[PDB]
């Protein structure tokens, strides 16, 4: 008879998966949750959904599952499936997936003192508010919320593990990630019933360099072409074709931006404002060309276009 | 021996998951359902499908699961998995997903008086009739239906929880949400068999600002260019190229709208009507230019185009 | 002791889920199936797959599950999970999804006489042959097949419920739906082994109005422009640019149609034929323009183009 | 007491789902597998994945599950769920889906002699090598492999059912399907351990007619326009615009082909070669036009273009 | 009574699925893992995710499951479901899918000596760092990591099977695959707790030929057209239209590249740099043309363009 099998049989002789591990009803169970983010899978701005891959550390004491190590040949720790032992109900409150199931959560560690540890590796797809006021490059703070959904603070008191809680670098594909300090706070949706929760913040700064040559370069080139457009002679039979080419190009760029850029509700993106400015400027330039004393009007239009361009550039540097 | 484990064993000594919690066959079970919508995930107009993330509150009395709190060390409430206790069959009648399963519905609260509470967090993807008569910005009322699918009113009588039933703001990404008062009504698909149901209305008003610069700005610019087109001299060798550019631009815009706009059956969108108007106007302008006394005909065509444009603008303001 | 629990225990004292409810091997079990379609979710022509949301009514007699109502306090009907009682194996033979599972099929009704009823709400994604000979607007008959997959007629004899079998309107987004009468017929894949099946027909007529302005309007406008093209003077230095614009526009329309229209195998769509006609006509017009006594040749080409256009229009009205 | 229930209880009094139905360890179990393909769902060339809908016939003898029919009221055959009786492990070796589960495989037939039959309807999404050397229309042979994954030939000897094994037509949407004769062969990944497998071939010939007007018609029209291009006078101020239009059109066609055509590794498609040829020809024509004794050079260029076009046409007919 | 059934009953008389197969707590269990990759399904650069189809070989000794073959009629090996026998927890640490479940892992081999073998066929979708510094054709080394997630080295010591560990060819669709030697190394996330892991490297070199004609050919043709552009006479009334055509073509190519090319963060692709160079060159050429002693300036611009083109070509050959 194996000692480990005997210990497992004795420990779980009469155990249920729906009994809170507390010796008395008055007593409470302490659960420490640590959210570690390893890799940032992606962040869809159209859906405002951040997908990341990282494991979560759960630690809770248990008055049961306790044995003297010397009795069982000096055994220290054991591995037990999560199904049998009691499992605290911790769920991401801002979860976005249809179902919330850990990819690898079939094992947990039990010590002789009763400190039950769980490290279920999981893929977290959560919601995050994105501020797209400036979109050459942005940096948003996304908060992941953990805690019980039906256990009040009087039953389980979620906490944090201060050990090894120092800030450290997070691997990212095109986003530089900084791990913010985690905090805890209580929601109160009913009198005499407060539910604790842990909020962990992650600050992501965009580092992609392709967006500069896909969203800014064509727009600035179209603006430069529109600026050069008034220099064409009115009677050269080329202003109309040049304006048609500019309008087709800016329409194509607008279509590409609509296909790529999301439908932000708060504020229009700076790229969208630049595209609208180039659209209106090319339209007015085409109107002046088709209408065409004339030299002074053309000079005034060129000056207005130049001042608009310099204002746009200084604003871009201001939000750069 | 833990008191909680003893209470759980005694309560569920002989209990089935298919027995309605009623003391007599004549008696009925009252179930109160409250539908709370937290965030509006999205609303696809092409599929007419509204996806939202919100929890649902179920409250039903049970003659079983009753105990004296003083006996079990003054215990007040307990947490039990939904699998063991009886679960009322409440399903969204207008559900759109292949399967209807709550993301987090593995726990429920049982009080000493027997009032069983359930708060299964779920992601509801339902159907909603969308009126796209005016599409610069719309506001539709979407109704979510809850209730039993095989339990008649004689078995379970769905109701509403008037407590804290006041209207309140709902978080939204690009839609402003107002929570309508919920009502109840009975379907009758067979004589002597009426099934109750709860209908909750949500009024969503669009707040996206990008659609103005992606659907209206290019169309109005093309219309303005078409208006300016007749001013070109007939013999300037530029009307044909200008018309070709306009037709290419409007064709590209039509392609973009077809890729973006859904295939509405009721009425054509106002943007589609505007695009058709600009198409026909540019076509007739190109025909007049290629055909080209002439001055009076051109003036009449310009007047007709101007009156059409002013009628379109006044209609747009009317539905604005 | 609750009467309902006692009745449920007595009825299912020794019951299996793999035993056909028949008193003798010679006897057979009658199953009545009614397929009701509530909403037509969509119909993808590229995959030829029709997705609909509707419930299915199953009614089968059972010599077991029978009790005297007076004994159990006059109880009339009971609700039982589908897992315990025997379930006839009815599956859509033309099913297209990877798995065939009802969304809400966890409950069934049992009467005192033994008439077991089941109403599992389900989402049916089936195959349908689409005739795309005429595609301004079409109307196809799609057949849904129900029945056993391994139960022969000697075991289960599928039938129809003539009660309330009258034709009625079906809700649709962009398709008008008519419910055809359902029939039954027997497949014979082996001698002395015939399997019954129920075929229900649904006639869907397209009602979308956006396809007229996305598939027909640009094509007819390009055809009109090509018709007007020969009127341009040969020496005006504008025929070549006009032809280039027309060819670019028709190429863009062809790309849009390829992205939208499926790859039909039977016959080419009428829109595709119209696009091919406009392509060849614009190509020949460009060839004649570049080649350019000349007046008579141009008049003959214009006459041929006009007769081709009138033939196309009369054919379109014929299939309209 | 029902006779069928008594027979089912007696047959499965002590039965396991992990015991091979063999009376002795030396003896082996014969399994006959027949792969029948009903409909070809699709064949994605980009992923090289063929999805089809067809049922599979399994027949294996069992020394258990045997009874005298006369004892049980002359019962002949019974239906039993696949979970209880032993199930041979037959899996498509070239399966492409994440999971391999039959859609409807919950029932099987047991005869009095012990011949266990199984007809699990399934949707097979397998891999197939596609030869895209000629892509106006192709015809590939796709092989589906069935057999055990951990059972050697010494345990289960897969075979074929020669009865009704004649070639017959297979329904297809846009592919004509011919059922090839199935064969068996043994893999040997370890000495003294050979695993049998059944390979069934299906020959599919493309029948789509839309690809001719979406991939060949625009290319041939662009080639014809490029051929006509040299006839334009050098000083007509139209060669440059015509070349620009041709290059824009061929670029759009290349974009469409890239979006549609997959990234074949073996050989470039014939359509891609034709597009490259038209690209290079239009580029050289534009270079000659911009550079522009001249008449002889233009005649030589026209002759070279004509000979290249005739070579391309004869090659196309050769692979046609 | 079948001998095999008796052996299976005797072996698993009292066995648990959560007991490590070790005779003593001090002793450890050796597990040998071999990762074999058969086919490379694909490698998405946008997500940096490599999907492959290959089986994994697990071999672990067991002090239990041991019997004398002579007793049970000389039986050598048996097949047992993975559910009953103990299963080592081996999971891909860099897994990308939501869930990690083997497609076919329902069987395992048990020998008389106790050497338990498992060959669960699986589809591995892992993460891989992609170096896109040069993108005419690349070759990346992707590492797959296997090992325990909660078992330390003191419990299970993962190793490698040196038998038949020679390098061999791997089938690929458009990637040539070389199998690198596998190694083992230990992670240490806590003192006195080291977890072993096996890293297997696969070197993939791109072999697709379509990317040359979709990403390089249009870019080089546009560059050649831009080079030829300065040769146009300033007063020919064709420089403006030629520049408009070039800018439209390069904008379309940029849109296609943005739709196809991923958003790399490390370095911009060489194709993107080439497109930016052609954009800036065509813009400056258009500026010089519109501005237009002049001959010397045009010659200097042509020389600068030629030297830039030759530098780009020599760099491309350097990274070719
Ligand atoms: C609803 C949950 C509260 C969960 C909790 O931890 N405790 C109370 C739960 C009580 N129950 C519902 C179980 C019982 C109800 C009893 S009742 O009487 O109602 O039936 C809270 C916790 C975190 C909250 C938000 C995120 O942070 C950030 C975010 C940014 C936005 O711009 C708006 C959207 C969003 C996603 C917010 C939505 C919502 O606000 C959340 C999910
Ligand atoms: C069919 C269900 C009724 C469910 C119910 O709550 N009670 C009766 C069910 C009785 N069973 C079927 C179980 C037994 C049949 C016995 S039988 O004798 O038939 O076999 C009812 C309840 C809500 C209804 C609609 C939505 O509101 C709004 C909506 C807008 C449209 O523009 C048309 C589409 C849509 C989705 C409507 C469809 C349908 O109309 C629904 C789903
Ligand atoms: C294959 C099933 C028959 C199912 C049935 O109801 N009864 C016999 C089954 C017998 N089993 C296979 C179980 C045992 C074989 C014994 S064996 O000796 O073979 O091993 C029959 C029933 C309905 C049939 C079609 C649809 O209507 C319409 C349709 C339009 C097309 O243009 C071609 C495609 C399609 C989808 C057709 C395919 C096929 O034709 C179907 C699925
Ligand atoms: C790997 C399986 C063999 C399965 C089998 O039926 N028997 C041996 C299995 C032995 N096990 C792995 C279970 C134990 C290993 C013991 S070990 O000592 O290794 O640990 C064989 C059977 C069929 C084979 C291919 C297809 O036909 C056609 C195809 C066309 C291509 O262009 C290249 C890709 C592809 C998909 C091929 C891949 C592979 O080649 C397959 C899946
Ligand atoms: C996190 C795992 C370690 C797993 C392991 O094998 N052993 C330790 C696990 C210990 N647990 C978490 C279970 C307990 C924690 C105790 S605690 O006290 O924290 O609660 C390690 C093993 C392999 C690692 C990477 C890949 O190779 C390559 C790769 C390329 C990039 O450019 C950055 C991204 C990426 C995907 C890396 C991420 C991460 O780095 C991985 C997944
Ligand atoms: C919960 O734990 C926190 C420690 O962060 C402590 O401050 C608080 O008093 C605890 N509350 C209860 C009810 O135990
Ligand atoms: C159901 O509850 C409602 C309360 O909203 C009540 O008006 C109605 O009479 C009840 N019906 C039955 C049958 O209990
Ligand atoms: C099956 O039911 C039909 C009723 O539609 C009947 O005509 C037929 O005779 C029945 N067949 C058997 C074998 O019971
Ligand atoms: C397996 O069956 C085939 C029949 O196709 C037979 O030729 C072969 O000898 C059999 N092998 C064994 C080991 O039974
Ligand atoms: C684990 O196995 C390796 C063999 O690769 C061996 O070198 C090492 O010492 C072993 N460690 C333990 C703790 O058994
Ligand atoms: Na043009
Ligand atoms: Na164009």
PDB file of N, CA and C and ligand atoms in Angstrom, chain A residues 248, chain B residues 248, chain C residues 248 252, chain D residues 248-249 252, chain E residues 248 252, ligand 12:
ATOM      1  N   UNK A 248      -9.250  61.595 -55.838  1.00  0.00           N
ATOM      2  CA  UNK A 248      -9.273  60.136 -55.873  1.00  0.00           C
ATOM      3  C   UNK A 248      -8.315  59.545 -54.844  1.00  0.00           C
TER       4      UNK A 248
ATOM      5  N   UNK B 248     -15.603  57.767 -61.157  1.00  0.00           N
ATOM      6  CA  UNK B 248     -14.729  56.837 -60.448  1.00  0.00           C
ATOM      7  C   UNK B 248     -14.818  57.038 -58.938  1.00  0.00           C
TER       8      UNK B 248
ATOM      9  N   UNK C 248     -11.477  51.313 -66.221  1.00  0.00           N
ATOM     10  CA  UNK C 248     -11.166  51.289 -64.796  1.00  0.00           C
ATOM     11  C   UNK C 248     -12.426  51.115 -63.957  1.00  0.00           C
ATOM     12  N   UNK C 252     -13.289  47.919 -61.569  1.00  0.00           N
ATOM     13  CA  UNK C 252     -13.613  48.050 -60.152  1.00  0.00           C
ATOM     14  C   UNK C 252     -14.942  47.378 -59.831  1.00  0.00           C
TER      15      UNK C 252
ATOM     16  N   UNK D 248      -2.787  51.200 -64.045  1.00  0.00           N
ATOM     17  CA  UNK D 248      -3.724  51.204 -62.925  1.00  0.00           C
ATOM     18  C   UNK D 248      -4.657  50.000 -62.981  1.00  0.00           C
ATOM     19  N   UNK D 249      -5.173  49.680 -64.170  1.00  0.00           N
ATOM     20  CA  UNK D 249      -6.060  48.535 -64.294  1.00  0.00           C
ATOM     21  C   UNK D 249      -5.376  47.224 -63.961  1.00  0.00           C
ATOM     22  N   UNK D 252      -4.825  46.975 -60.245  1.00  0.00           N
ATOM     23  CA  UNK D 252      -6.056  46.590 -59.561  1.00  0.00           C
ATOM     24  C   UNK D 252      -6.335  45.101 -59.739  1.00  0.00           C
TER      25      UNK D 252
ATOM     26  N   UNK E 248      -1.293  57.506 -57.637  1.00  0.00           N
ATOM     27  CA  UNK E 248      -2.432  56.620 -57.420  1.00  0.00           C
ATOM     28  C   UNK E 248      -1.995  55.161 -57.356  1.00  0.00           C
ATOM     29  N   UNK E 252      -2.290  52.714 -54.103  1.00  0.00           N
ATOM     30  CA  UNK E 252      -2.978  51.427 -54.136  1.00  0.00           C
ATOM     31  C   UNK E 252      -2.066  50.309 -53.646  1.00  0.00           C
TER      32      UNK E 252
HETATM   33 NA1  LIG F  12      -7.965  55.123 -61.018  1.00  0.00          NA
END
